[PDB]
């Protein structure tokens, strides 16, 4: 299957027609997505198979063909870009200044952008094009708007 680095849609034919359930990142021969997109299932890439290699429900992350390779982090100051890949629509970059999720175990960057659930797994990038995390696990705040954590693994 296709091993070229880049952003990919994650699709299924189980439901009506062809449905986009999420998005992921191919980097250094490893496919990276959120756990809630695949539930840890195997994936097809052309005539090839991608098997899960590492995953964690609490982090809501999963890697295929090898260990998690994405290690860039938001610097806490600069604007970033969501490389949003929505269902049935072209990849589009949106620039934003992240907010913060404050937890009992430390702070994480968060982006306040709302896209269909099938956009989950889209990469958030820094100014050098490095992936600092994936979009799609977050919360619905007071006024009903969606805010996603910038979710990053550990390399």
């Amino acid at each position: 299957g296709e091993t070229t680095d880049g952003v990919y849609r994650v699709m299924t034919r189980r439901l009506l027609g062809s449905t986009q359930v999420g998005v992921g990142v191919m980097q250094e021969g490893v496919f990276h997505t959120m756990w809630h997109v695949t539930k840890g299932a195997a994936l097809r890439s052309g005539e090839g198979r991608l098997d899960p290699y590492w995953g964690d429900v609490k982090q809501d992350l999963v890697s295929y063909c090898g260990p998690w390779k994405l290690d860039a982090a938001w610097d806490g100051l600069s604007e970033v870009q969501l490389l949003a890949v929505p269902p049935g629509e072209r990849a589009k970059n949106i620039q934003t200044l992240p907010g913060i999720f404050k937890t009992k175990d430390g702070d994480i960057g968060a982006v306040a952008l709302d896209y269909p659930a099938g956009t989950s797994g889209s990469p958030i990038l820094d100014k050098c094009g490095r992936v600092i995390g994936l979009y799609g696990n977050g919360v619905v705040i007071k006024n009903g708007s969606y805010v996603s954590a910038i979710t990053q693994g550990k390399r």
Partner: protein, 39 residues
């Protein structure tokens, strides 16, 4: 079964649309990986 399809390169776009606010929120993360607001 699930399958993947390429959608693009991972690059920063010079002069992209700039939007969204930057809220500072107190949140909790449960064992199921769900985030919730703390008040």
């Amino acid at each position: 079964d699930m399958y993947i399809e390429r959608a693009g390169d991972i690059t920063w776009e010079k002069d992209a649309e700039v939007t969204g606010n930057s809220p500072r929120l107190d949140v909790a993360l449960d064992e199921s990986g769900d985030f919730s607001l703390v008040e």
